[PDB]
Amino acid sequence: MNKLSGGGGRRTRVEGGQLGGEEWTRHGSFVNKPTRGWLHPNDKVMGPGVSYLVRYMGCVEVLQSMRALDFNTRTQVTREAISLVCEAVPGAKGATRRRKPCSRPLSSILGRSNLKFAGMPITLTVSTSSLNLMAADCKQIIANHHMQSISFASGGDPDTAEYVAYVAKDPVNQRACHILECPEGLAQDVISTIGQAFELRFKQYLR
């Protein structure tokens, strides 16, 4: 009887499928169910890719701990992070200009913004777990696809007002963020966050 009593075969063995939480369970869990991607379905990313012109702004560093701010620290951090990148490269009017004391939001969060090449118009291409940039004015292309983690941080609201903030922390020995400005380009996704190019048939590298 290979009907009533289950059926088939193949290897399977016992596995884990019931993990709640060490202490209290109130986190998000999106695994095999959702159906959305950057701007439009994965097809729009993995295929044509959603690329638009965006002024890349240095990098806002953050050495926050695992318990900053009496709430979340989303605002405080990004707010001081972006406003900080301006204190560095105020040439791009956003939060400050000329000069400003500033310091930090509230807790130990926030680190330091680097102003190597802030405010540089270029074509940013977003793809499923792979973001490649292209120097528009520089007349060249920027290759940077080492990390692919963009979920909670600053989709398109908690940042400052009219500035785009990004988060990148793959390993546990650095963790840094970057800033970007959308002059009627990527703004489509960075403003509303239609979705997120996240599929990857496999974890990531496993190497």
Side-chain angles (χ1 to χ4, degrees):
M1 299 105 242
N2 238 43
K3 260 150 126 144
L4 199 55
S5 183
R10 222 254 300 169
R11 190 243 241 181
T12 297
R13 220 152 262 162
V14 283
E15 237 195 76
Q18 56 251 335
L19 280 145
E22 183 76 323
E23 232 286 280
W24 283 27
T25 348
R26 43 91 245 192
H27 69 97
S29 316
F30 61 102
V31 184
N32 186 78
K33 253 214 209 253
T35 300
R36 53 263 225 81
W38 202 287
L39 205 98
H40 249 59
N42 298 342
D43 246 320
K44 223 299 217 223
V45 249
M46 23 168 216
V50 207
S51 85
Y52 260 119
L53 196 298
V54 274
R55 244 198 302 193
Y56 173 53
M57 348 208 96
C59 71
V60 291
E61 183 127 88
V62 188
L63 272 78
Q64 55 134 217
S65 299
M66 294 248 107
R67 208 107 151 291
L69 204 300
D70 273 42
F71 239 103
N72 278 113
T73 332
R74 297 309 203 199
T75 71
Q76 3 277 129
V77 181
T78 334
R79 205 196 189 73
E80 193 93 346
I82 305 177
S83 179
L84 162 74
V85 69
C86 321
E87 170 152 331
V89 55
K93 39 139 65 156
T96 199
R97 167 168 134 200
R98 222 95 95 65
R99 63 207 167 78
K100 178 100 118 197
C102 272
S103 25
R104 257 163 301 167
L106 215 137
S107 197
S108 346
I109 66 281
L110 233 303
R112 86 95 147 288
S113 81
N114 205 359
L115 52 155
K116 238 128 113 98
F117 303 113
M120 177 205 160
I122 72 81
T123 20
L124 198 206
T125 296
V126 66
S127 357
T128 36
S129 297
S130 253
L131 245 87
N132 326 109
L133 275 50
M134 320 154 130
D137 224 7
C138 257
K139 258 163 201 241
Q140 65 191 115
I141 302 140
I142 347 296
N144 247 265
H145 40 287
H146 248 207
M147 312 157 176
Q148 56 243 297
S149 213
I150 43 285
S151 56
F152 255 111
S154 169
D157 267 304
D159 37 288
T160 32
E162 221 198 286
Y163 255 58
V164 202
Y166 292 55
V167 63
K169 42 171 175 190
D170 251 41
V172 64
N173 24 260
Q174 249 208 22
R175 318 157 35 268
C177 290
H178 304 233
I179 301 302
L180 165 137
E181 188 226 20
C182 289
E184 301 139 299
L186 212 302
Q188 318 209 352
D189 202 76
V190 307
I191 197 83
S192 358
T193 320
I194 311 98
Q196 54 256 315
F198 213 138
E199 199 228 309
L200 243 155
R201 314 199 168 75
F202 319 124
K203 175 70 110 173
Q204 261 124 263
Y205 297 127
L206 306 186
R207 311 308 233 172

